[PDB]
């Protein structure tokens, strides 16, 4: 199992006309596999949607993925911006 | 490392034959020397002065030469043509 493969490639034709949105070298970088989209980085480790307790067929349409991601409440953020100045 | 040795430059004869310095021994900011101006502890800054890269470029390496009740003073003149 090797480590030092290249795994990125560049085509010789300068097509740099409509490409300011992609990832440029500074040309266009062309990798050997796709990307990986990760929804939320921090798992919410309790929350019986995920913990599955052993007590007591049901569906639930939760709002967004933001339930599973430890977001702070806004009153603390306003308190901290008041503590800013 | 990065330290200048303490000796081994004797650029004196080229200033004797510089023809800008008014030395009568031979015939054939806005300051000039940084003896009042700091250089913020880089020696490379002293290479901006035009009489000092003269003594690093045109210098050489020298080897050191090694060695009554009333004084009577006598003046001695010296006048020799040579080449």
């Amino acid at each position: 199992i090797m480590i030092d493969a290249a795994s990125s490639f560049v085509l010789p034709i300068s097509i740099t006309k409509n490409v300011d949105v992609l990832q440029r070298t500074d040309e266009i970088l062309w990798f050997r596999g796709p990307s990986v989209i990760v929804n939320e980085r921090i798992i919410n480790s309790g929350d019986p949607h995920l913990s599955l307790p052993l007590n007591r067929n049901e569906k639930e349409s939760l709002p967004g993925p933001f339930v599973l991601g430890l977001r702070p409440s806004a009153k603390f953020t306003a308190h901290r911006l008041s503590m800013l100045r | 490392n990065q330290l200048i040795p303490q000796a081994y430059i004797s650029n004196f004869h080229n200033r004797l034959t510089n023809e800008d310095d008014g030395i009568p021994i031979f015939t054939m900011g806005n300051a000039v020397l940084p003896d009042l101006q700091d250089q913020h502890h880089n020696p490379f800054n002293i290479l901006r002065y035009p009489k000092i890269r003269d003594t690093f470029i045109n210098g050489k390496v020298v080897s050191p030469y090694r060695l009554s009740g009333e004084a009577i003073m006598i003046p001695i003149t010296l006048d020799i043509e040579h080449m």
Partner: peptide, 29 residues
């Protein structure tokens, strides 16, 4: 376009780790 072999970018591991960024240490004329 299907005959357009691409150029590998090699990383050369010792370049990736610790490369810094000689006359500017004044001891060598």
């Amino acid at each position: 376009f299907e005959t357009m072999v691409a150029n590998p970018i090699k990383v050369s591991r010792l370049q990736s780790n610790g490369v810094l960024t000689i006359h500017y240490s004044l001891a060598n004329f």
